[PDB]
């Protein structure tokens, strides 16, 4: 697109446009039918039902689909081969189906991204102002406007569409939706450079033009305008899969791998063992219900919910549940200067007076050092700073503090007024004590401000005068030094430039201040001053000093960027401002460390070609958008790896996407913090997009996965620690609920390898995963940190589940739960009559209803009912034994490197969870009614004790290992048991 470069006549003949009438109605209809979007096309969306439906299927739910169907078939076999079979497999069939839906509904709530960023562009451009088609101005609708159409923009009418500026005067617009900066930019009908985004010759779709009329022909309308492209590109963008989701999908793939492999194996050793179709069918619903954790994906969803509830109490709202953690696994965090790292409040920083430069306080809370008030040049300068025709506050915001009060004027005029108001306390007193009689407004070439003020003693006239320092250097003949008016000599001129260029060195926009005392004899009381033709001296004034203005950081920012870089997270500035201002803020906030110089700085010091300067020598980078435009992905990845403190400046909104996609090439998870419409693509493309809650635009909020309602950038550091904490706590919930799968599974594989009567029932299993072992698993979301993961796995560069966790859940700790469970099963069978010698080889007769007189080891004969009643009591006891050996499992999973006596049992939910674990088990096994479908029978008070010794063994074993692994650090023990 080079239409801004080509002259007006060329574009007019390209589009058939006229500089005086633009187009006719028929040509307007033709352009509409050719293309009439003139708006952001709504995005393609998928309904909720299809997203939910595809969420009903997974690795843990597809298996429960096969399990649920199988018992439905099993119940059919029983019914047509036994017309009076009670309903046990059918209700179990329904139960497993409900688990699919409830877990298929917990997953949906985890991924419920509600970001209607297209509907967030509610502003757009309602009530289009004026169009010169048909030789008449029409206040027509917002969208009807098309290309080749002459528009009439005025003050604050949101330029209707991308127009090639044709004619205008005093035209200033604010493309704050393009580069984030809201400072007015003067537009003229002349292209200034090749890049169309930095020419005064071209307007844009989204600019709430401050002043200057303006005439332009519409180059394009929507979906091709600069704003139109971004909105379409922001809408048609997805981060992909969040880091925690990728780990969870990896977790599901691992467990489904064993479950489908084990069930496939046991469909072979079953059919080769003589099991009938029903016996294998009843068996299959055992080894695919014990294996799959029915209450694990739901557990993780609630665990993320709890920490999102806790982290929202720090004014940190979260839109996507899984986005809570990805601030912990992130390693490179892009940012924005104006609005995110700075207050977006142009304020004075440095003051030149009496050949001295001192820093001025910039904190919002005004906690800085006011050590300069005692300076001799302070009162005169602030008097000049206040009496220079000034600006004014607002009455309707008078009650707000001085910094929060709104003003009328330019940003430069605002900055001096707040500083004077803050310094003198109340400059209205100076207004009352110093009346105004004359003023000269800011022009477009001379742009000075001359005003006349009546002297307090009513003896003469005071002259106030500020402007660009170079312009008033020639207009000043004397300089105030230490309260003494000194004529301007060669030394002062060199000193003036030295401070002036030094002040511009930190990118701080500056303006000079000077005054003059009108003689009383030549200008007595009642003297009349002519503004059009000045009757007062204009040149050779008394120079006072230089004021500086720069957008300063917030209070929390310098600490946050320091701690983020300390936690392994590199920080990269990605702004849209000029490199000089970006480099000044980047060094100030802490992105560029002090004493670290880029190629330009190093070459500058060596006075040599920057090209010959070795890139390695330099550390930071100030890469400009133009340089970023013509380099490909090869060099881009090099500079992202070679340096560590890169500062990208003058970047178009589409270039931030290139940066984020560039960083993600290394395999890192990027985070973007922004405020404006320009960074919306970066917020949608990054793994986690953090926005601003007060100084942020509407689209930036709606296109972000997190909102900082308090604007405190220090909440990022807290989000990092809480993100890395919830990841570890989730891992400690996984290692706890995976230790129940082998004690649940072992009775089934002990039922087929050897011929033992079943120990655990399938219905009993559902009372563990969906029942007791939910609150303790939820409780681990409350566990506090131990030591620091800052150095170990800085951005949590590890898997959620690995071989060490499986070997410690399916291996060591898990087996000691199965042995503890079976010890109770052998105790009850042995005590009631069935000795272990008789038990092995009894599977065929135990289930069979043919034998009503199966004999135990003492010569008794049990019926089918008394046999099954005994088996169900062991089913209850195995359940409670699993629960009892789960008290120790929780306590030893509370910690991971430190011993329990060091950490201390100080987790309110966990202590309550242990009480909840026992009470549910006790209630579910000691109340009349639950032997009628849950197969749960009262237990003797002596049958809760057998699993207790195995509980103590697990606790003694784990704590013992912890001591060994905390000792002998890096020991193979830790190398193969530290999950």
């Amino acid at each position: 697109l080079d239409q801004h470069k080509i002259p007006l006549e060329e574009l007019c003949r390209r589009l058939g446009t006229n500089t005086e009438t633009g187009l006719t109605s028929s040509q307007a209809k033709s352009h509409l039918e050719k293309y009439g979007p003139n708006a952001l096309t709504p995005p393609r969306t998928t309904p909720e039902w299809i997203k939910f439906c595809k969420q009903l299927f997974g690795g843990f739910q597809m298996l429960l689909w096969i399990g649920s169907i199988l018992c439905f078939i099993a119940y059919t076999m029983e019914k047509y081969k036994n017309p009076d079979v009670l309903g046990d497999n059918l209700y179990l069939g329904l139960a497993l189906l409900f688990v699919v839906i409830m877990t298929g509904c917990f997953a949906y709530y985890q991924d419920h991204n509600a970001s209607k960023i297209m509907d967030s562009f509610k502003n757009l451009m309602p009530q289009f102002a004026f169009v010169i088609r048909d030789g008449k101005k029409i206040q027509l609708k917002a969208e009807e406007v098309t290309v080749g159409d002459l528009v009439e923009v005025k003050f604050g009418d949101r330029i209707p569409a991308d127009i090639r500026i044709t004619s205008c005067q005093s035209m200033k617009v604010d493309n704050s939706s393009l580069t984030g900066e809201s400072e007015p930019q003067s537009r003229s009908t002349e292209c200034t450079n090749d890049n169309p985004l930095e020419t005064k010759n071209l307007a844009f779709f989204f600019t709430n033009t401050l002043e200057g009329t303006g005439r332009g022909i519409v180059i394009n309308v929507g979906d091709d305008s600069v704003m139109g492209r971004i909105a379409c590109l922001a809408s048609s963008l997805d981060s992909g899969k969040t880091p925690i989701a990728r780990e969870i999908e990896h977790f599901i793939h691992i467990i489904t791998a064993m479950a489908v492999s084990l069930a496939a194996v046991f469909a072979v050793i079953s059919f080769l063992y003589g099991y009938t179709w029903l016996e294998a069918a009843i068996f299959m619903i055992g080894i695919i219900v014990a294996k799959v954790p029915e209450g694990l994906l739901a557990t993780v969803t609630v665990c993320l919910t709890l920490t999102a509830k806790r982290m929202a109490k720090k004014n940190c709202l979260v839109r996507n549940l899984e986005a809570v953690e990805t601030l912990g696994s992130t390693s490179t965090i892009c940012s924005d200067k104006t609005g995110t790292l700075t207050q977006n409040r142009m304020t004075v920083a440095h003051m030149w007076f009496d050949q001295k430069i001192v820093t001025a306080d910039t904190t919002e809370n005004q906690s800085g050092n006011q050590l300069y008030r005692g300076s001799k040049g302070f009162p005169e300068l602030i008097r000049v700073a206040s009496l220079c025709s000034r600006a004014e506050f607002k009455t309707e915001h008078a009650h707000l503090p001085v910094l929060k009060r709104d003003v009328n004027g330019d940003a430069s005029e605002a900055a001096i007024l707040k500083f004077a108001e803050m310094s003198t306390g109340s400059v209205m007193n100076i207004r009352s004590k110093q009346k105004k009689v004359s003023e000269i407004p800011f022009n477009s070439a001379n742009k000075y401000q001359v005003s006349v003020h009546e002297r307090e003693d009513k003896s003469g006239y005071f002259l106030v005068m500020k402007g660009a320092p170079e312009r008033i250097l020639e207009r000043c003949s004397t300089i105030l030094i230490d309260g003494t008016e000194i004529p301007l000599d060669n030394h002062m001129k060199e000193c003036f430039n030295n401070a002036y260029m030094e002040l511009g060195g930190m990118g701080e926009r500056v303006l000079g201040f000077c005054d003059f005392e009108l003689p009383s004899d030549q200008y007595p009381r009642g003297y009349v001053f002519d503004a059009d033709e000045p009757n007062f001296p204009i040149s050779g004034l008394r120079f006072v000093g230089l004021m500086s203005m720069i957008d300063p950081p917030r209070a929390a920012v310098p600490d946050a960027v320091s701690k983020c870089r300390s936690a392994g997270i590199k920080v990269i500035m990605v702004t849209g401002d000029h490199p000089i201002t970006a480099k000044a803020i980047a060094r100030q906030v802490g992105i560029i460390s002090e004493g670290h110089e880029t190629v330009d700085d190093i070459a500058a010091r060596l006075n040599i070609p920057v090209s010959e300067v070795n890139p390695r020598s330099a550390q930071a980078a100030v890469i400009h958008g133009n340089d970023l435009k013509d380099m490909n992905s090869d060099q881009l990845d090099d500079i992202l790896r070679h340096y560590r403190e890169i500062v990208f400046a003058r970047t178009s909104p589409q270039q931030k996407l290139i940066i984020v996609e560039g960083v993600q090439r290394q395999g890192e998870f990027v985070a973007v913090t922004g405020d404006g419409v320009n960074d919306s693509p970066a917020l949608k493309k990054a793994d986690i997009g953090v926005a601003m809650g007060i100084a942020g635009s509407d689209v930036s909020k709606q296109a972000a996965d997190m909102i900082l309602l308090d604007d405190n950038f220090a909440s990022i550091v807290t989000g990092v620690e809480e993100g890395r904490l919830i990841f570890d706590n989730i891992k400690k919930s996984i290692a706890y609920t995976l230790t129940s799968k082998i004690p649940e599974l072992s009775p089934f594989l002990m039922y087929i390898l050897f011929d033992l009567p079943l120990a655990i029932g399938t219905v009993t299993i559902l009372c563990i995963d969906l029942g007791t072992d939910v609150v303790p698993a939820i409780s681990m979301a409350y566990e506090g940190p131990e030591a620091d993961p800052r150095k170990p796995r800085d951005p949590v560069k590890e898997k959620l589940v690995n071989e060490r966790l499986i070997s410690m859940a399916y291996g060591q700790i898990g087996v000691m739960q199965a042995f503890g469970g079976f010890f109770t099963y052998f105790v009850i069978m042995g005590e009631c009559g069935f000795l272990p010698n008789r038990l092995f080889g009894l599977r065929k007769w135990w289930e069979s209803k043919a034998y009503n007189d199966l004999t135990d080891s003492y010569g008794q004969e049990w019926t089918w009912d008394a046999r099954k009643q005994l088996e169900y009591t062991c089913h209850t006891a195995f359940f409670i034994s699993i629960v009892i050996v789960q008290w120790t499992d929780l306590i030893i999973c509370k910690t991971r490197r430190l011993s329990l006596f060091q950490q201390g049992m100080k987790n309110g939910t966990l202590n309550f969870a242990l009480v909840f674990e026992t009470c549910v088990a006790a209630f579910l096994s000691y109340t009349p009614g639950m032997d009628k479908g849950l197969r749960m029978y009262p237990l003797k008070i002596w049958w809760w004790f057998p699993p207790m010794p195995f509980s103590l063994l697990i606790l003694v074993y784990d704590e013992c290992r912890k001591f060994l692994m905390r000792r002998n650090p890096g020991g193979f023990l830790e190398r193969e048991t530290y999950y």
Binding site: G274, F823, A850, Y858, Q860, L870, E976
Partner: protein, 292 residues
């Protein structure tokens, strides 16, 4: 993509020495784990009476409700069914049932021939402690004898029935012809009245009654000849696991059974502290007999 990396050891997870270390660690872990489990099982064992159950009678889940069981039993690998199949006549499949019935009744003839601790009990003679009451085979008549092929020869099979031996069980029998409940077959009520009119001692016993289950099985089963007493006696039952215990048996005798027609039978005991249920099969047994 194999990514096997066998050249730099790396047997998919570790080097050879690392695998050796993890294997010896797992081996010892499981070894002392099995040692702990076996030690606990032995500790539990040393607190068991191998002659008397730890929980007896009503404390256990066996309860005070016994159940019957037909002896002939199906062949092994047919543990699901309760069907007795045979063809009457010289060229028949009677051999398995006859041999099984002979094997079951083996202790009632060999050890009873000596009877060192056996006691010739009777209704008015209580057993001596540590002595199992005798049960002579001749008490089962002549037709239920291995000599006449246990009746599986002429087409008149005879099936033994026995009570569950619940440890320490104390049967309570009806003390009058009016105490008996309803729902008892009229045949058993008439038998009870005859016993009460005759020797009053014989009424102290548990009463058996076999009948067809399905309404048609009532009339397709024919008459039944309980060759011994019509129900078990009441002077065997305080079981207490006496060595060489012989459970009393009531020998049915299906005199009239139609050829090639299945019959499902259900026999229930009749004592005051005995329940009966057609579904849980408490206090009753269910076997199916079909003759071809």
């Amino acid at each position: 993509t194999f990514i096997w990396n066998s050249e730099t050891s790396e047997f998919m997870g570790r080097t050879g020495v690392n695998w050796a270390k993890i294997t010896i660690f797992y081996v010892i872990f499981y070894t002392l784990l099995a040692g702990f489990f076996a030690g606990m099982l032995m500790i539990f064992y040393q607190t068991l009476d191998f002659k008397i159950p730890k929980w007896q009678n009503k404390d256990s889940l066996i309860g005070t409700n016994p159940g019957l069981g037909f002896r002939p039993m199906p062949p092994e690998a047919q543990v699901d069914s309760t069907l007795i199949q045979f063809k009457h006549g010289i060229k028949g499949d009677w051999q398995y049932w006859v041999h099984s019935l002979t094997e079951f009744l083996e202790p009632y003839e060999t050890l009873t021939s000596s009877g060192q601790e056996f006691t010739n009990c009777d209704f008015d003679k209580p057993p001596q402690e540590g002595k199992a009451c005798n049960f002579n085979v001749e008490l089962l008549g002549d037709h239920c004898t291995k000599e006449n092929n246990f009746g599986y020869e002429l087409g008149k099979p005879c099936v033994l029935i026995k009570l569950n031996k619940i440890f320490g069980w104390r049967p309570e029998v009806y003390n009058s012809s009016a105490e008996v409940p309803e729902d008892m077959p009229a045949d058993l009520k008439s038998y009870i009245k005859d016993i009460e009119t005759g020797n009053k001692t014989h009424m102290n016993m548990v009463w058996l009654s076999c009948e067809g289950e399905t309404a048609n099985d009532k009339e397709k089963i024919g008459t039944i000849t309980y060759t011994p007493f019509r129900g078990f006696p009441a002077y065997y039952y305080p079981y207490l696991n006496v060595p060489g215990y012989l459970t009393p048996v009531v020998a049915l005798q299906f005199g009239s059974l139609q050829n090639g027609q299945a019959v499902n039978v259900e026999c229930k005991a009749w004592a005051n502290n005995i329940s009966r249920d057609r579904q849980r099969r408490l206090g009753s047994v269910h076997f199916e007999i079909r003759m071809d």
